[PDB]
Design an enzyme around this catalytic site. Sequence first.
Site, PDB file in Angstrom:
ATOM      1  N   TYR A   1       0.787  -1.235  -0.131  1.00  0.00           N
ATOM      2  CA  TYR A   1       0.034  -0.017   0.102  1.00  0.00           C
ATOM      3  C   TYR A   1       0.846   1.216   0.035  1.00  0.00           C
ATOM      4  O   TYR A   1       2.071   1.182   0.705  1.00  0.00           O
ATOM      5  CB  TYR A   1      -1.000  -0.129   1.043  1.00  0.00           C
ATOM      6  CG  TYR A   1      -0.413   0.085   2.499  1.00  0.00           C
ATOM      7  CD1 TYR A   1      -0.071   1.080   3.076  1.00  0.00           C
ATOM      8  CD2 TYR A   1      -0.423  -1.104   3.307  1.00  0.00           C
ATOM      9  CE1 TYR A   1       0.312   1.264   4.471  1.00  0.00           C
ATOM     10  CE2 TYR A   1       0.423  -1.149   4.494  1.00  0.00           C
ATOM     11  CZ  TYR A   1       0.669  -0.004   5.171  1.00  0.00           C
ATOM     12  OH  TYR A   1       1.286   0.130   6.470  1.00  0.00           O
TER      13      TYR A   1
ATOM     14  N   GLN B   1       2.921   4.398  15.942  1.00  0.00           N
ATOM     15  CA  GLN B   1       3.710   3.866  16.704  1.00  0.00           C
ATOM     16  C   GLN B   1       4.039   4.947  17.652  1.00  0.00           C
ATOM     17  O   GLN B   1       3.415   6.070  17.738  1.00  0.00           O
ATOM     18  CB  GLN B   1       5.040   3.618  15.628  1.00  0.00           C
ATOM     19  CG  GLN B   1       4.573   2.323  14.672  1.00  0.00           C
ATOM     20  CD  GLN B   1       5.967   2.086  14.007  1.00  0.00           C
ATOM     21  OE1 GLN B   1       6.905   1.278  14.505  1.00  0.00           O
ATOM     22  NE2 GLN B   1       6.388   2.717  12.924  1.00  0.00           N
TER      23      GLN B   1
ATOM     24  N   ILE C   1      -1.203   3.188   9.167  1.00  0.00           N
ATOM     25  CA  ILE C   1      -0.381   3.352   8.186  1.00  0.00           C
ATOM     26  C   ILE C   1       1.099   3.009   8.923  1.00  0.00           C
ATOM     27  O   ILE C   1       1.691   4.170   9.570  1.00  0.00           O
ATOM     28  CB  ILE C   1      -0.352   4.814   7.480  1.00  0.00           C
ATOM     29  CG1 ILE C   1      -1.893   4.974   6.942  1.00  0.00           C
ATOM     30  CG2 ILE C   1       0.796   5.114   6.323  1.00  0.00           C
ATOM     31  CD1 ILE C   1      -2.217   3.992   6.119  1.00  0.00           C
ATOM     32  N   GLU C   2       1.923   2.122   8.482  1.00  0.00           N
ATOM     33  CA  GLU C   2       2.935   1.720   9.088  1.00  0.00           C
ATOM     34  C   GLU C   2       4.328   1.853   8.110  1.00  0.00           C
ATOM     35  O   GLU C   2       5.434   1.731   8.751  1.00  0.00           O
ATOM     36  CB  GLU C   2       3.086   0.185   9.318  1.00  0.00           C
ATOM     37  CG  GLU C   2       4.078  -0.431  10.427  1.00  0.00           C
ATOM     38  CD  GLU C   2       3.664   0.446  11.898  1.00  0.00           C
ATOM     39  OE1 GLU C   2       2.504   0.081  12.455  1.00  0.00           O
ATOM     40  OE2 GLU C   2       4.826   0.908  12.267  1.00  0.00           O
ATOM     41  N   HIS C   3       4.267   2.430   7.141  1.00  0.00           N
ATOM     42  CA  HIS C   3       5.094   2.737   5.926  1.00  0.00           C
ATOM     43  C   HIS C   3       4.775   3.810   5.001  1.00  0.00           C
ATOM     44  O   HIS C   3       3.695   3.864   4.941  1.00  0.00           O
ATOM     45  CB  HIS C   3       5.784   1.567   5.485  1.00  0.00           C
ATOM     46  CG  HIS C   3       4.581   1.019   4.542  1.00  0.00           C
ATOM     47  ND1 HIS C   3       4.236  -0.233   4.596  1.00  0.00           N
ATOM     48  CD2 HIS C   3       4.415   1.262   3.292  1.00  0.00           C
ATOM     49  CE1 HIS C   3       3.388  -0.731   3.599  1.00  0.00           C
ATOM     50  NE2 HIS C   3       3.507   0.325   2.834  1.00  0.00           N
TER      51      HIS C   3
END
Length: 273
Positions: A81, A157, A125-127
């Site tokens: 994504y 995070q 959204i991690e990246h």
Amino acid sequence: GSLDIAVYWGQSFDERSLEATCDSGNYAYVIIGFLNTFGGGQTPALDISGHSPKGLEPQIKHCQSKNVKVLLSIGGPAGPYSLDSRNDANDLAVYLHKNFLLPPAGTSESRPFGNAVLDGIDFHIEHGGPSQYQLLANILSSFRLSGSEFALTAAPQCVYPDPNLGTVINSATFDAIWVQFYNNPQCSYSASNASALMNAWKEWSMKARTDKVFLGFPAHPDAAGSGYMPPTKVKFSVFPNAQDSTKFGGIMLWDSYWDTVSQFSNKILGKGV
């Protein structure tokens, strides 16, 4: 009339069903993860661990009938994504709105979860970001003001400000955030010491521009690489200070699959194990 728990659902084909998860009575929010594929010429796709998307329709409705809010989470721990162009943001906003946040209209809509209408969208959204996630939030928020009311939430995070979501959180657009106090020893419970956790919580509760900040914890030692904190320790060490914040929303648990095994939320709530 006391502790609200948000939980992620959708992480294992063999997990307790969505409807049974809601029937536990332990959760105020169930977050279906994930729409993990979008952007950069890709067609949108769910990875909900092999669960039937259409089959979720009556389960979502059952959850809602029990006054559990059901959200769809975009992104996830990993996946193809991205949201690099303004057009990507427009496209995803419209797709989410038409297919999940409004009743069906016409016949061309894919309706992954059928005629269910979800209670909101969770930004996990991690990246990649901040990318065009601010524009995505802007367009969804515009829709929040022009039709069906729904929630926007985020799962940053634990280092403030979050590299992917920090700027979007700063816009005050999220109704709630659940901070991941795990997979990050610098801001999580670690080496049997809660100092770093409590320092990070203090910062999030002071600075995050949202009405509700939830503390995200792993439901079992195996559920995360690090950061597991036993439920008696969360009750004893986190709650008295957290409850002193006007922004304290409750806790988030990663995740339903593991909570079923561990009975973490039962222990938090004082229900029989």
